[PDB]
Amino acid sequence: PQITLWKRPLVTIKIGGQLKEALLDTGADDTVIEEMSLPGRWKPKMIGGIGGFIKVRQYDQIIIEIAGHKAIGTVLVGPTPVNIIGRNLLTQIGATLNF
């Protein structure tokens, strides 16, 4: 689809067998999801932006479905205020900015 930006670009994702709402976020290098369980190995990481840093768990090789498009990549899990799909997964669904 072509998404205009009058409203937040929210989509439905499937991750870890669960459906969630997430924001397509071109300004995020990384995908960050609210607290949830994922299978497999993780490591701790600190990420920062406006307001400072949070501690997250880094899960690698996680399959996700984003508005019906499958991808795989790293997912950071922790106390983010909103689920964000960052560039690491937006590339995999072929997302571009057009003007």
Active centre residues (catalytic):
25
**Contact of residue 25 among Cl ion, Na ion, ligand HWY, none (CB under 5-8 Å per partner type):** ligand HWY
Q: Restricting to residues 29-48, name those near ligand HWY by CB under 6 A.
A: 29-30, 32, 47-48
CA 59 to CA 25: how far, in whole Å? Answer: 19
86 binds Cl ion (CB under 5 A): no
17: Cα within 13 Å, side-chain hemisphere: 3
The only residue of 71, 75, 84, 89 in contact with ligand HWY, by rule CB under 6 A:
84
Q: Which residues ranging from 42 to 81 are in contact with Na ion (CB under 5 A)? A: 60-61
Of 14 and 95, CB closest to Na ion: 14
Gap between the Cα atoms of 36 and 16, Å rounded? 8
- Give me the least distance between CB of 77 and its own copies, in Å please: 13
Residues 6+ apart with CB under 8 A from 27: none
Chain centroid to CA 75: 7
